[PDB]
């Protein structure tokens, strides 16, 4: 049993090595996680007013596909793995919702191989932020400059929501188009302000004041709040990445 | 349309993987190739210039 | 029957090579092709299981007698991707793709009845 | 002005933010803000098998997308 | 196939925004000010007596029950006066300020740093750099000179 | 010599019943000298002794793909080379399930042919380079190296059931090594060979400009064997047979194959290519 | 001689310790200073190969006699980065340092050849 | 002693040729008692016995870093500590290539000097942490 | 004695889990119920530290021969929480609840004397 005992010796030493390498992954992950947990104390404030603008009632899918001509989707994925089922469930939701008039510009290296192989033509490209520096307003603006290439009608950003260290669910931002949103603004600012969906905030004084506001300023208002939405989505998915990696590493251990 | 998995059958895509080859050494080989082609393209540039 | 058996054995040899990864990291760290091969080899392995009339005492099911011509078409459908919407568990301990589709209908029915049941329990709650 | 030059209001705000991060004092705040101003990202799209830089929208702010 | 196993939440819902009431009563005495940079806040619903803002139209003052208005912030400085008579000044980079009739001011900006964390020394060198960029005839550099000068001039006037 | 393990079990039985002392794995110990006496009698005799010969292909069964057993090491010690057949590859599809990393030959160019020296020296380099890359799940589908192409097509040609004639092997490998068979897909590499050896495409479609070089005659084997492929009289006719065979294939056959959508027709083309992989 | 030998031994030690990492993480998870010694050890590993006159039958190439001074002024150069611009495969299966730059020039030429032939193939079709 | 593994091979040769009953690794039973006849003669004598002393540094070669071997197990069971050299560290420029965790001295401080207790205790309180830190950090 | 011992084992198991959570998340992540048992587990672990009449001459501190029923009543108090105001370090290197309270009083008196020293040393100057 010479070959057999040497085989098991090799596997044993290989696993003793691989174990401490995975522990190194864990420690680096905590070194990058504790920096980000500071955000959790200072969380859920930057779109507190923005919801009042970009939120609407939960519109059905079958109606918006008929209303629209070219939808858009933005799944926010990661650059490095050992995360979990985040990327895979993010793909499962898109094939769950898949339809003819869609387009995908993702974020992260892991949607590069997946999206092109599952969604052949709708997927176009991606964006890659090497995470040596935190994410920037200019980075979210660079994403807006990519999205503006498309004449999209509704942009569904998809990301992961850090409910807790043990729960990283999905979450979406349904962004209407500017030219449709301005008309919905005028239509709702005309009639009396009655909330058409529970849990929604009334915004009639806002939809009057924005109607009073000039063109370029409202364009910048829209681009600005969408930039903050994008940046908050990426930040929440970063925190969910660093919260799910520790689980998908301790289970490996 | 789901996935064009490679296989032995003709309808499936071409499988250029080899079982005898080892996956463990593949990343170092990939980096080796990606560096070698950069060095060759730079040597070509130096010779042309 | 020859080519099908050869391709099944090859698929399972690949599933075995991928076990060394799946046991360590997970299915989420595999390429789309790899995890499709995994999700299909698992289906083949569960379909290979079946009950026998002798072991009715244990599996609690009547035993089936699969004819060769109906044995080859089922593997060919499971090999060419002709049946991938069916889940993995519909292949466990059954005989014949008709029995598969029956069991899958039964499980879909039961799952929907559980969803209406939980809906009514939530409305009453 | 910079409006009809072709740059966006968001690029304008980022230029202002970059300037503020330049002129501000050295300290922990600057240590935080160099992260919020440094450019290191890229873009790629997948060819039939290979990766290619989608250079239609550059990351640097002095240029203009086309 | 499973009928829609997933049901992702609307991420807007997790926030708790104001409820703009048309007002059937009196005004509070102090504004509830919330100020936010990119993602993290610096001030979360703090009582404030008054706040003075810079805009493209010019400079404005905000008090309790101020008229509901929204407008661009011009890249400059900001002054905040709390109820205790103190003051706090913050350099900003644009943004939008929303003033509710109930007396709840939500400000969103791209950057926020106090004046104390900036020196006129390092600012001085960048001035003539911006001037050289403005004078250098080039569409890519002239605008950059103009913008850097646009942000430096309020700083040069505020430090002085 | 079919299994020598059963001759070592028999020698052990003999010696132990005759009350010889056991040894490692209960063998008497001189079973190395036993197989040495058996196998050193193999030789290529001197011209003084007629230039006769006897080749030997002993066979030894293996357990769990180990090369650490006693008799296995004792016979690897004796025999020149070895043809290692891996159960992981037999079960993994390829037949003959030769493992090239563990199978070598300690004679080399001096045994094989002038026409095979120049092909084997290219295939050794090609397989040594493909061994380093083939671990990669192919991502650069169009950025695949020519080595990544030629190696995979060469493995397709390695898939067989029965023996292949020398002329029928060289002319099929030349196209690989020179890259004529790169536009086709992997799966039709043997139907290609079938048409190359049994359905002469330029002879059928009238594109006959070659004066002599055609695969129907089957007596060009000896001229190839003698003169070699890198010769003035055989190189150009060879290229002006293979490039036309490739073009006719890519035009008439590849297109019709890629136009198949039905399941009946795809299963029929499946079984056709497996039959071609067996018979060719 | 002694110091170059012991530095190469220590480097190949680290080289093993870094296959132990690259097999798991990837080359991207290492500093540029570490990638440098990775490349240097991989180049010493490929350079220490050599053809022999006895292997003319198998290799099909003539053996090379390497002198000690040439065998030290090439290892020390590759040890202190004096030749890092030279590619990797130029070290594979050669003798002295003069053969290296020859082989690298050759591979540059045969790469430009395939490049221009691809260009003319694209122009033709 | 350079070395005892060959002394044990010689004792094996003797015992097998004189037809003594063999045991693990073809050694007899009393090869532990053989090495105990030798190493136990090392001692720190009493002030009634001149206060002389015999120290011992028996060398024993391992194979593929095995310590489950019979002779290695025995001499470790006999000796008052151990030193363990490693080839993975000898090659990595670490010479002498000890492995400080496997190397043990049950005589911790009673041998050390007054100037040495503080020093070695600081090096212990430095290296026990140096391993927990160096092991978790990356290569880069 | 059995139920108390099994409750201490449950406590220390939960404390190992929460220590593996604290090293990842942090003690501030835990609820108010968890930190209470993390305190009681730390108190138990420090109370296990016992002196020895063997080493009483070596280290100087006395040894404590503590009975069985008294020990069970001590751990039952420390488990029912009726002795929680005592700090953690007071349980270090003691034996018996009736004996630790003298050390707790000594510690409180020492801290009060240090306060009375510092206050008057600052007031005199």
Anisotropy-based shape of chain C: globular
**Helix content bin of chain E:** 10-25%
Number of domain modules of chain E: 2
Strand elements of chain E, count: 11
Number of helices of chain C: 5
Oligomer: part of a larger assembly
Q: Work out the radius of gyration of chain C.
A: 17 Å
Beta-strand residue fraction of chain C? under 5%
What can you tell me about this protein's structure?
- This is part of a larger assembly, with 1 copy of chain A (253 residues), 1 copy of chain B (49 residues), 3 copies of chain C (125 residues), 1 copy of chain D (66 residues), 1 copy of chain E (160 residues) and 2 copies of chain F.
- Chain B is mainly α and 49 residues long.
- Chain B starts with 25 loop residues before the first helix and ends with a helix.
- Chain E has 2 domains: 95 residues, no CATH class; 42 residues, no CATH class.
- Chains in contact: A-B, A-C, A-D, A-E, A-F, A-G, A-H, A-I, B-C, B-F, B-G, C-F, D-E, D-F, F-G, G-H.
- Chains A and E meet through helix 2, helix 4, strand 4, strand 5 and helix 8 of A and strand 1 and strand 6 of E.
- The PDB classes it as membrane protein.
Brief description of this entry?
Chain E has 160 residues and is of the alpha+beta class. In chain E, 23% of the residues lie in helices and 32% in strands.
Protein topology:
This is part of a larger assembly, with 1 copy of chain A (253 residues), 1 copy of chain B (49 residues), 3 copies of chain C (125 residues), 1 copy of chain D (66 residues), 1 copy of chain E (160 residues) and 2 copies of chain F.
Chain A: H1 2-41, H2 50-54, H3 61-67, E1 72-75, H4 86-97, E2 104-107, H5 110-118, E3 123-128, H6 137-147, E4 154-164, E5 167-176, H7 178-190, H8 204-212, H9 215-250
Parallel strand pairs in A: 1-4, 2-3
Antiparallel strand pairs in A: 4-5
Helix pairs in contact in A: 1-9, 6-9, 7-8
Chain E: E1 9-10, E2 31-36, E3 41-48, E4 50-54, E5 59-62, E6 69-72, E7 77-81, E8 87-92, E9 96-99, E10 104-108, E11 112-114, H1 120-135, H2 139-159
Parallel strand pairs in E: 2-10
Antiparallel strand pairs in E: 2-3, 4-5, 4-7, 6-9, 7-8, 8-11, 9-10
Chain F: H1 5-17, H2 31-39, E1 43-44, E2 53-54, H3 70-78, H4 87-91, H5 114-133, H6 146-158, H7 166-178, H8 189-198, H9 201-204, H10 220-227, H11 235-258, H12 263-279
Antiparallel strand pairs in F: 1-2
């Amino acid at each position: 049993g010479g070959g057999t005992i040497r085989f098991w010796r090799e596997k044993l030493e290989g696993y003793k090595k691989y174990h401490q390498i995975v522990k190194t992954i864990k420690m680096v992950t905590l070194a990058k996680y504790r920096q980000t947990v500071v955000r959790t104390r200072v969380r859920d404030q930057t779109l507190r007013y923005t919801r009042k603008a970009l939120d609407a009632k939960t519109q059905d899918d079958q109606e918006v596909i008929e209303k629209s001509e070219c939808l858009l989707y933005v799944p926010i994925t990661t650059n490095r793995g050992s995360c979990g089922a985040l990327n895979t469930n993010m793909v499962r939701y898109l094939q769950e919702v898949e339809n003819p008039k869609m387009t995908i510009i993702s974020v992260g290296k892991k949607a590069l191989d997946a999206m092109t192989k599952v969604f052949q033509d709708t997927y176009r490209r991606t964006i890659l932020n090497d995470m040596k520096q935190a994410m920037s307003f200019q980075f979210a603006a660079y994403v807006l400059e990519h999205m503006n290439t498309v004449p999209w009608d509704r942009a569904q950003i998809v990301y992961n929501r850090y409910h807790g260290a043990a729960s990283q669910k999905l979450a979406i931002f349904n962004l209407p188009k500017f030219e449709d949103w301005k008309q919905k603004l005028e239509e709702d600012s005309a009639g009396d302000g009655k909330i058409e969906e529970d849990g929604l905030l009334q915004s009639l004084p806002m939809k009057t004041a924005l109607g009073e506001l000039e063109e370029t300023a409202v364009e910048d208002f829209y681009n600005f709040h969408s930039c903050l939405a994008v940046l908050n989505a990426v930040s929440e998915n970063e925190l969910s990445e660093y919260a799910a990696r520790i689980v998908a590493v301790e289970n490996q251990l | 349309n789901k996935v064009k998995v490679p296989g032995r059958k003709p309808q499936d895509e071409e499988d250029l993987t080899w079982a005898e080859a080892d996956r463990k050494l593949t990343p170092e080989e990939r980096y080796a190739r990606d560096k070698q082609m950069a060095l060759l393209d730079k040597m070509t540039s130096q010779v042309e210039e | 029957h020859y080519n099908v058996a050869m391709d099944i054995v090859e698929m399972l040899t690949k599933y075995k090579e991928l076990q060394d990864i799946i046991a360590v990291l997970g299915i989420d760290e595999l390429s789309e092709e790899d995890k499709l091969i995994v999700d299909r080899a698992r289906k083949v392995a569960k379909f290979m299981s079946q009950p026998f009339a002798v072991a009715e005492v244990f599996t609690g099911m009547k035993g089936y007698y699969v004819q060769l011509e109906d044995c080859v078409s089922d593997f060919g459908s499971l090999l060419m991707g002709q049946c991938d919407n069916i889940p993995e568990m519909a292949f466990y301990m059954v005989g014949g793709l008709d029995s598969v589709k029956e069991k899958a209908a039964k499980m879909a029915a039961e799952a929907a009845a559980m969803r209406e049941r939980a809906r009514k329990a939530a409305e009453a709650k | 002005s910079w409006r009809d030059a072709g740059i966006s209001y968001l690029r304008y705000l980022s230029i202002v933010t970059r300037c503020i991060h330049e002129v501000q004092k050295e300290g922990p705040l600057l240590t935080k803000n160099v992260r919020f101003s440094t450019i290191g990202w890229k873009s790629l799209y997948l060819d039939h098998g290979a990766t290619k830089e989608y250079t239609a929208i550059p990351a640097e702010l002095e240029k203009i997308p086309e | 196939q499973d009928p829609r196993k997933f049901f992702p939440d609307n991420g807007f819902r997790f926030f708790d925004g104001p409820e703009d009431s048309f007002g059937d009563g009196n005004i509070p005495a102090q504004i509830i000010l919330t100020l936010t940079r990119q993602d993290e806040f610096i001030l979360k619903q703090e009582p404030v007596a008054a706040i003075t803002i810079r805009t493209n139209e010019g400079e404005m003052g905000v008090l309790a029950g101020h008229e509901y208005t929204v407008q661009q912030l011009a890249p400059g400085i900001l002054e905040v006066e709390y109820e205790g008579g103190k003051k706090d000044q913050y350099v900003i980079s644009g943004g939008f300020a929303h003033v509710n009739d109930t007396g709840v001011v939500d400000i969103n900006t791209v950057e926020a740093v106090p004046l104390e964390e900036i020196d006129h020394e390092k600012l001085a060198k960048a001035l003539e750099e911006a001037r050289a960029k403005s004078q250098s005839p080039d569409e890519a550099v002239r605008i950059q000179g103009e913008i850097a000068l646009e942000i430096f001039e309020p700083l040069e006037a505020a430090l002085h | 010599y079919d299994d020598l393990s059963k001759q070592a079990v028999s020698y052990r039985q003999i010696s132990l019943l005759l009350r010889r002392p056991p040894g490692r794995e209960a063998y008497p110990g001189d079973v190395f000298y036993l197989h040495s006496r058996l196998l050193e009698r193999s030789a290529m005799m001197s011209p003084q002794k007629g230039s006769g010969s006897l080749t030997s292909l002993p066979i030894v069964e293996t357990l769990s793909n180990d090369v650490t057993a006693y008799i296995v090491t004792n016979v690897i010690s004796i025999t020149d080379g070895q043809i290692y057949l891996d159960a992981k590859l037999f079960t993994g599809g390829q037949r003959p399930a030769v493992n090239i990393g563990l199978s070598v030959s300690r004679v080399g160019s001096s045994a094989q042919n002038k026409a095979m020296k120049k092909v084997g020296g290219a295939l050794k380099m090609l397989m040594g380079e493909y061994r380093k890359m083939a671990g990669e799940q192919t991502s650069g589908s169009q950025n695949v190296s020519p080595v990544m192409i030629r190696g995979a097509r060469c493995l397709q040609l390695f898939n067989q059931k029965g023996p292949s004639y020398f002329m029928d092997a060289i002319v099929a490998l030349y196209a690989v090594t020179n890259g004529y068979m790169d536009d086709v897909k992997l799966q039709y590499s043997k139907f290609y060979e079938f048409l190359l050896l049994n359905k002469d495409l330029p002879v059928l479609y009238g594109q006959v400009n070659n004066k002599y070089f055609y695969m129907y005659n089957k007596n060009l084997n000896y001229f190839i064997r003698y003169f070699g492929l890198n010769h003035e009289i055989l190189e150009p006719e060879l290229k002006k047979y293979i490039e036309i065979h490739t073009n006719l294939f890519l035009d008439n056959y590849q297109s019709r194959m890629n136009e198949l959508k039905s399941d009946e027709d795809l299963v029929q083309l499946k079984n056709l290519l497996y039959a071609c992989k067996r018979t060719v």
